[PDB]
Amino acid sequence: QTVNELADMQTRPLLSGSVCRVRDTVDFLSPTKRAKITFKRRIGIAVGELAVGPTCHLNNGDEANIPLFDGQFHKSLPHDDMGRVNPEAYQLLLDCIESNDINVCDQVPSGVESDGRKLVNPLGGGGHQVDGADSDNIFIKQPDNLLSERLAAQQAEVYWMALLRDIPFSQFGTNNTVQMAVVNLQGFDAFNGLSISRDADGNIDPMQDLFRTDWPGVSSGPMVSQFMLANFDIDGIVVEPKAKTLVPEMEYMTGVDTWLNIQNGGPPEDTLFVDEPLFIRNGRDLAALSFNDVLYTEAFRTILIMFNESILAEAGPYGSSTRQEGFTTLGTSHYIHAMAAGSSSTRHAWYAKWQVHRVLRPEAYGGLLHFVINIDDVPLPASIVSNTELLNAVESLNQAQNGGTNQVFLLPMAVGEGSPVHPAYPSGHAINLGAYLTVLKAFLGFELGQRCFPSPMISNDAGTDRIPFVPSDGDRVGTCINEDGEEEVGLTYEGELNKVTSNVAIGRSHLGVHWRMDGVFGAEMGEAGAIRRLQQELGGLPEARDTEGPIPPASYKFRLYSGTMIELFPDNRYMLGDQMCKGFFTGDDFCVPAD
Amino acid sequence: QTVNELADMQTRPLLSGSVCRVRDTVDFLSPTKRAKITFKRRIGIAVGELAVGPTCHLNNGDEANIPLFDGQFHKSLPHDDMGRVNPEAYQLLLDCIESNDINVCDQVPSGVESDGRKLVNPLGGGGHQVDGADSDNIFIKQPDNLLSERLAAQQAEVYWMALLRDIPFSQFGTNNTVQMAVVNLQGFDAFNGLSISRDADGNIDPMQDLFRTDWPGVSSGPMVSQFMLANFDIDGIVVEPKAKTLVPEMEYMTGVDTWLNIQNGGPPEDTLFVDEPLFIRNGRDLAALSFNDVLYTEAFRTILIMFNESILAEAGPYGSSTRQEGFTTLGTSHYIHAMAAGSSSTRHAWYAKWQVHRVLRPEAYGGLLHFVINIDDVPLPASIVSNTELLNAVESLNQAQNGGTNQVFLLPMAVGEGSPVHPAYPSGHAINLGAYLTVLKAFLGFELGQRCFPSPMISNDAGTDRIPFVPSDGDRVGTCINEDGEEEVGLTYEGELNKVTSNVAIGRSHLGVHWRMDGVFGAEMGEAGAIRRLQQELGGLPEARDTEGPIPPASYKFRLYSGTMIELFPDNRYMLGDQMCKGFFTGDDFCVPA
Amino acid sequence: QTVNELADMQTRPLLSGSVCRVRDTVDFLSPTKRAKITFKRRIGIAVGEL
Ligand code: VO4
Numbered sequence A: 001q002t003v004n005e006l007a008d009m010q011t012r013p014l015l016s017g018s019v020c021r022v023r024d025t026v027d028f029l030s031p032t033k034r035a036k037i038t039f040k041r042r043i044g045i046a047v048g049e050l051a052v053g054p055t056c057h058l059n060n061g062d063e064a065n066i067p068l069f070d071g072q073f074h075k076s077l078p079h080d081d082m083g084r085v086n087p088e089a090y091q092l093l094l095d096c097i098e099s100n101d102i103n104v105c106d107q108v109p110s111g112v113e114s115d116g117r118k119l120v121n122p123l124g125g126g127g128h129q130v131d132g133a134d135s136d137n138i139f140i141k142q143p144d145n146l147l148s149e150r151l152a153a154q155q156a157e158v159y160w161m162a163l164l165r166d167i168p169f170s171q172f173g174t175n176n177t178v179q180m181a182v183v184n185l186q187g188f189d190a191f192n193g194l195s196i197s198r199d200a201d202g203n204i205d206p207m208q209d210l211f212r213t214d215w216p217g218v219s220s221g222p223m224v225s226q227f228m229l230a231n232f233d234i235d236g237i238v239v240e241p242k243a244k245t246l247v248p249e250m251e252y253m254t255g256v257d258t259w260l261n262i263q264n265g266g267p268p269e270d271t272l273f274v275d276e277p278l279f280i281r282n283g284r285d286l287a288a289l290s291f292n293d294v295l296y297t298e299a300f301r302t303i304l305i306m307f308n309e310s311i312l313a314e315a316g317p318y319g320s321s322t323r324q325e326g327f328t329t330l331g332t333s334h335y336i337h338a339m340a341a342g343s344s345s346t347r348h349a350w351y352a353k354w355q356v357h358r359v360l361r362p363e364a365y366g367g368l369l370h371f372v373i374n375i376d377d378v379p380l381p382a383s384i385v386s387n388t389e390l391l392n393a394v395e396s397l398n399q400a401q402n403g404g405t406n407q408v409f410l411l412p413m414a415v416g417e418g419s420p421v422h423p424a425y426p427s428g429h430a431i432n433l434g435a436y437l438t439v440l441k442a443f444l445g446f447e448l449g450q451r452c453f454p455s456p457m458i459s460n461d462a463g464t465d466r467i468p469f470v471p472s473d474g475d476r477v478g479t480c481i482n483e484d485g486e487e488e489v490g491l492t493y494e495g496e497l498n499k500v501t502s503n504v505a506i507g508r509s510h511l512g513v514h515w516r517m518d519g520v521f522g523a524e525m526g527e528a529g530a531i532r533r534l535q536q537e538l539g540g541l542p543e544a545r546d547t548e549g550p551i552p553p554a555s556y557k558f559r560l561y562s563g564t565m566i567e568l569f570p571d572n573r574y575m576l577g578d579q580m581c582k583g584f585f586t587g588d589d590f591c592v593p594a595d
Numbered sequence B: 001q002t003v004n005e006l007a008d009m010q011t012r013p014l015l016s017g018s019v020c021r022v023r024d025t026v027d028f029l030s031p032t033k034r035a036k037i038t039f040k041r042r043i044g045i046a047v048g049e050l051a052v053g054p055t056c057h058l059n060n061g062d063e064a065n066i067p068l069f070d071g072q073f074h075k076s077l078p079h080d081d082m083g084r085v086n087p088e089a090y091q092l093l094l095d096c097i098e099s100n101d102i103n104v105c106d107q108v109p110s111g112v113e114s115d116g117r118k119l120v121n122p123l124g125g126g127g128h129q130v131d132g133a134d135s136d137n138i139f140i141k142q143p144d145n146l147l148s149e150r151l152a153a154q155q156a157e158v159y160w161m162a163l164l165r166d167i168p169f170s171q172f173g174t175n176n177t178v179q180m181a182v183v184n185l186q187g188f189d190a191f192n193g194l195s196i197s198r199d200a201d202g203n204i205d206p207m208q209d210l211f212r213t214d215w216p217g218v219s220s221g222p223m224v225s226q227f228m229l230a231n232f233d234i235d236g237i238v239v240e241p242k243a244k245t246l247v248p249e250m251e252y253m254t255g256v257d258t259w260l261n262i263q264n265g266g267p268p269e270d271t272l273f274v275d276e277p278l279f280i281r282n283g284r285d286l287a288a289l290s291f292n293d294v295l296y297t298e299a300f301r302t303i304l305i306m307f308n309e310s311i312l313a314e315a316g317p318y319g320s321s322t323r324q325e326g327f328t329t330l331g332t333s334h335y336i337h338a339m340a341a342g343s344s345s346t347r348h349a350w351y352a353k354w355q356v357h358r359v360l361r362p363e364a365y366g367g368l369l370h371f372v373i374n375i376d377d378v379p380l381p382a383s384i385v386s387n388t389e390l391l392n393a394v395e396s397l398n399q400a401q402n403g404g405t406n407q408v409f410l411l412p413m414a415v416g417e418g419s420p421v422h423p424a425y426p427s428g429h430a431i432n433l434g435a436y437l438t439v440l441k442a443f444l445g446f447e448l449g450q451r452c453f454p455s456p457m458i459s460n461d462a463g464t465d466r467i468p469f470v471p472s473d474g475d476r477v478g479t480c481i482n483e484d485g486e487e488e489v490g491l492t493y494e495g496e497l498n499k500v501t502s503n504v505a506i507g508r509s510h511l512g513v514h515w516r517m518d519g520v521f522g523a524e525m526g527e528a529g530a531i532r533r534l535q536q537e538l539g540g541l542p543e544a545r546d547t548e549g550p551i552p553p554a555s556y557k558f559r560l561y562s563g564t565m566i567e568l569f570p571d572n573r574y575m576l577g578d579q580m581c582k583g584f585f586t587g588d589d590f591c592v593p594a
Numbered sequence C: 001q002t003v004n005e006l007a008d009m010q011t012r013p014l015l016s017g018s019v020c021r022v023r024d025t026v027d028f029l030s031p032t033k034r035a036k037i038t039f040k041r042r043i044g045i046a047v048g049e050l
């Protein structure tokens, strides 16, 4: 560093946009070499994504074949006195969805003269997604047809749920009206599929099956996820999950006048909440949970609990590391950010809702059922039209609730506004939770998924206190593994994770705004969006490299809602069941054989 | 249709992986014409990212020039009785970082015979990002050198923080002890830059400036953000932000034997929290927040609060819509998911920590300062080595806190474990919060950012109750627009938003784990991480398309931490101050003209 | 084939223009690899001719 050399050295502004092809970073990759690999990888993902080919998003035929759009979403639009849509008005809504243009959509007629309720984001599915699977490129199953047998059965489930809102889950085994609901529901031959939970003999046990799914763990122990019942800690604030829930004994839209005013977009009945907050203990509380939440609220609570319990510290490669722990990759930050991103901001649900299916809501179905039994000529199945057991119970509730008008067969709603003003199929809640939780299950892994949820609880009947949960004979509680790998009879994390999506998705059904299918196949769609993200990300992570040493490369091995086992590997290969596959996951019914 | 046609019709299975070039979707784009445009946009984003070029991430010089690595991070590795790293253990740590290989890193030596504290993710900055700005491709400034005049002014700010931990923010204007600090700090000619707050004259006002930043609104009204004091609603559960904070008058690593055990990676003294939970109202509370948080906790609280008040219902295109609201794009779902994704999983902070800078923590410098005044030779500025006003206070604190041992000048830590086992520069908390709130300000917009935060409150000094906040002469509370569109005097959303990132960032300093630089520059790193993601996403959004009709295309118009106005448009175009720029944002000091 | 899975299976029209990346053909080449090789060869001819 000679006298002259020193005297000659110069400097310049070091700026954010300055470029340095040479720098002293402690990194086995050069500056330009790191950028290139990141570049190639991004191209690969875009090509790979395109190679999947367009999804078979096919309308079920109802819109072309049912008279005056009675099978279609048109809430907040102009209707006649029977709630049939002004056809021009619906035509203008189609122009809106078609166009994906915000100014066109603003021309869609409202059903009241002013302050009418807004369409919830009819442009929402049309965006070109930077990463993950594009808005129109995750499959969901076709919804059942308006006139179908299985739709009647689903509407019957929702009426039953409405009738049982206030009955604590604790007393389902011994309650008379829940037994009646069960017998009634088993009488429907078309009520299978849709992750419906039955016992070993094929019946619907009131305590363990009614209103639940058959996803692994959902029908073991209590209806309510341990995660919806535990204390969680946020920023050192210790929070008991007592919520200002919906008030017992109130229903809405129990008369043609209140129902029709809603269908047109007019001001709702005042929704009312309790004064003293309570734990979740009945169908109305699940309805409340799904009404008062906001995207990842429930999933955020659940990951906070999982951290607090220190279970995620044992997951992934660092589960075997004596000297290190992950944070930004295969540690806490990664887990919590990947969880939130996992649902692709609910955009697949929006594409399916508007561009594809445009399905009517259960409160709209109940309108037709009301007017079929009393003005209209829609050939709904005899299984619901002549179901006097259910229909007598339904009209009594409406009478008590509507100020004494008899023979009204509308779906009593748990909130004054009824459903959100967007189509019924699929549920956005179901996409969101389906995804968030898939992500959690993936990072936890199958094995740690079998670990016992420590100190299980259930709410008392008033929801003022929690009681310890202890397995008995009926419960369906299997083996789990404790902090010591020491086997116990108890609830598993995997099982309790499935219940969170199950409680939220089926909560929307208790609320009166969704059929089972919207939540069940909705959760599938979310599970697929999450898996697509996980797959894209995995290969670029440091811990995805195959290296020399005791610690092996990262992979995600876990179990889907359907129960089939999936294992995700870095190089876009995955195991599905006993099958090896390559490329981007589309669903559990599909596999491009690996070779 | 015909008998024959009907009879010949065939079906096949409808699977998730079936392909349909034709389908009856109600969409102006065909199935192939949608996939292509999406493909084209991904390519374009990838090419634009490549085009920015490799960032000038340049090591300080300390690692080449300071002897026995005394300016570098090596917590949890072996040391001698003076905290000097075993040089062979440090080489192995660099092999670990260089290799980005999990199994190499499992061979970095531990400073204790068994059970030692683990390295926090030295691989974490090596990931190849699917989107946004790649892991190594966000700029942060170089950290000040070990021997710089400004590093010592920063250490001195951290020592003062330690000494002022139990003093209620509301009493800062009148407190004698708080005066001492303010005077001592203005004494450093070097204490400028780093978003340091000062009044109309170049003075550090004890009440409105000390331990604050000069970001718009930060120095107005109360220290603590409204968002960290309001109730929030999660899933129907109403939460009062009363936290089991850290216990008063209780410091850690106040002796050489405790501090060294820690630097060697051994079991920490037990950190104690209060039995009855309190609201935030002093430095030790902000330290607690910053220790007890988890990634987007604070930001989640804040967006929940903004939703509750209905302020996001007014923002963006749908703010002008009579017939529609947004949700998945330019509404609630977009806002909350983009908020969380904005920090790129903290990975920019991680690359800078390990691959670039490898900066020691404030507690490690404290140990240098201690062995300098008493066993060592590193030439630290005399403006700290001879700062007897500050040095007396420090040994008093330590002496009142260890067994009564005199003349230790170690930094008194707020938690038993000291800092996390990762380097100091920048702060992960800062990039995280820097990003989240940037997203929040972008979606809110500048105009709505000027709106009055309703019913402002502060804690009482006990931490047990809230009191209405009332503006008075010397609050620097400015103008805000109310719910009727008339101008009031009161706190703005933007100011209160900024306080959130300030509270958490500076929170880590009150904790004793970061200098100002880590937080202030780190916050700017998070801000760019966030803007880069917003830019990439914007062009592809439905409301970003140019349409005919009264409602205009979407854009993000707001103001940076540094106070410079930014406007992001769909075409990867953006306005920075008065300049029209093109391409991807790197910082407010750089613009490729349009 | 459980009761639930059977009840959930769906069909769609099988048309001349339907596309299937997986099909049960007794063929050592996959559908896409067959199209790819044919594609690469057509380009080779065009290049070779030019
Ligand atoms: O927001 V929903 O699609 O669950 O009615």
Ligand code: VO4
Pocket: B419, B420, B423, B424, B426, B427, B428, B429, B430, B508, B513, B514
């Ligand atoms: O996790 V930190 O870099 O804010 O100590």
